[PDB]
Amino acid sequence: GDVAKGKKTFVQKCAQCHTVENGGKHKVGPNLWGLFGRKTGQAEGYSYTDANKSKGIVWNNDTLMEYLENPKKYIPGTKMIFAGIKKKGERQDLVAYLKSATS
Ligand code: HEC
């Protein structure tokens, strides 16, 4: 898991819609501070869809790796409109960074 390459991905692919830092604003999507170890649909102040709220699983390495490959198949109904990151190595690196930058 390479945190410098995952950071590049994030800025490329996610940053338009998300922030990571403590305090960080909700943009199109929620801020993601806290996210590991949290159940889905849990960032304070954000209005999620009832899908992302009710999925009910906890965000950890394994589940973030599955969700990122295809977000709409994992959360049918999500308003996170983004196709996925298909390649396993870029997903690892990108998970390895979120881990770092969200606590
Ligand atoms: C804007 C077009 C987005 C892009 C680009 C990415 N995401 Fe996103 N995301 C967006 C929204 C509107 C939402 C809420 C979904 C809903 O159904 O309510 C989200 C949500 C997430 C979540 C879930 C947060 C929760 O607390 O469970 C995560 C973990 C997440 N998004 C991660 C993420 C990453 C890593 C992205 C880059 C590849 C990414 N998102 C892109 C909108 C958009």
Curated annotation (Swiss-Prot):
Q: Which InterPro entries match?
A: Cyt_c-like_dom, Cyt_c-like_dom_sf, Cyt_c_1A/1B
Q: Which residues carry this modification: N-acetylglycine?
A: G1
The residues that the entry says bind heme c are C14, C17, H18, M80
Main subcellular localization, coarse class? mitochondrion
Protein's cellular compartments: Mitochondrion intermembrane space
SUPFAM superfamilies on file: Cytochrome c
Highest taxon, organism lineage: Eukaryota
Post-translational modification, briefly?
Binds 1 heme c group covalently per subunit.
Q: Cite the GO molecular-function annotations of the record.
A: electron transfer activity; heme binding; metal ion binding
Pfam families (UniProt xref): Cytochrom_C
**Keywords, comma-separated and alphabetical:** Acetylation, Electron transport, Heme, Iron, Metal-binding, Mitochondrion, Respiratory chain, Transport
One GO CC annotation: mitochondrial intermembrane space
Q: What PANTHER family would the database entry show? A: CYTOCHROME C
Entry similarity comment: Belongs to the cytochrome c family.
Q: What does this protein do?
A: Electron carrier protein. The oxidized form of the cytochrome c heme group can accept an electron from the heme group of the cytochrome c1 subunit of cytochrome reductase. Cytochrome c then transfers this electron to the cytochrome oxidase complex, the final protein carrier in the mitochondrial electron-transport chain.
Instruction: Give the protein's recorded name.
Output: Cytochrome c
* Species per Swiss-Prot/TrEMBL record: Thunnus alalunga (Albacore)
